[PDB]
């Protein structure tokens, strides 16, 4: 409503709480949150003055300091970095790809509604699960919602809400299967495996493949075929408060979050996050491509997997 009076800010903060359905513990938290809000406000304003290709805004995270945001919503990957795979049959190659100028699997009805992970380092399950929903639509024609909680609960190579691996989750689904979200809904806490209580799996895939890492072109090819699980560095302020446009940085290559790549255009790769529709462009972000950065911006080309289904 305006920055030129504390009075007007408090009002702004109030209507922002109402917009993001935000209820607090007590008024001691409310005042505290306002300070943080008001701090993030100055930063957003100072930054949307510069003329970048993207801008920030008072999204769902306007409430939180970067430190708190890091801890709660990042580090689904963090963990401790593999060393790249078993060293057997995965990587694909190249030769002569001819892909569309643009791709967006939403427009083929292959993508479910944006999910919210809450404060869990579970993004590795959502990233996986959404590329599974897609691949199945793409092959059988139906779009279904499958269970992130099941992976949370059941994947022994991963660490529940303290991070995990997308490739592991993909691979569980190829060897065992997965249940519908409604049979096994999301609680945002890890519990015991309840796969046996649920009867038959709803679906099973056939395998998983890694895409050649540090290779922009190999990832575009893959996206033109299906959504792909990818990882990136999402702990920065500019990322937290991202509202729209083509994200360009700054970010490092210390990946800590897993998301899904549902498309691309000439200058960007389109990415589905799991922080709900109150973040980004209704839950998505366009990340800049074509810079000849081997890593990709935010280390996007670091570690990419997708499910296989005949
Ligand atoms: Cl169900």
UniProtKB/Swiss-Prot annotation:
GO terms for molecular function: cysteine-type peptidase activity; serpin family protein binding. Leupeptin binds at residue 123. It comes from the Eukaryota. This is Papain. The keyword Isomerase does not apply. The active site is at 123, 257, 273. It catalyses: Hydrolysis of proteins with broad specificity for peptide bonds, but preference for an amino acid bearing a large hydrophobic side chain at the P2 position. Does not accept Val in P1'. One of its GO terms (biological process) is proteolysis. It comes from Carica papaya. Transmembrane segments: none annotated.
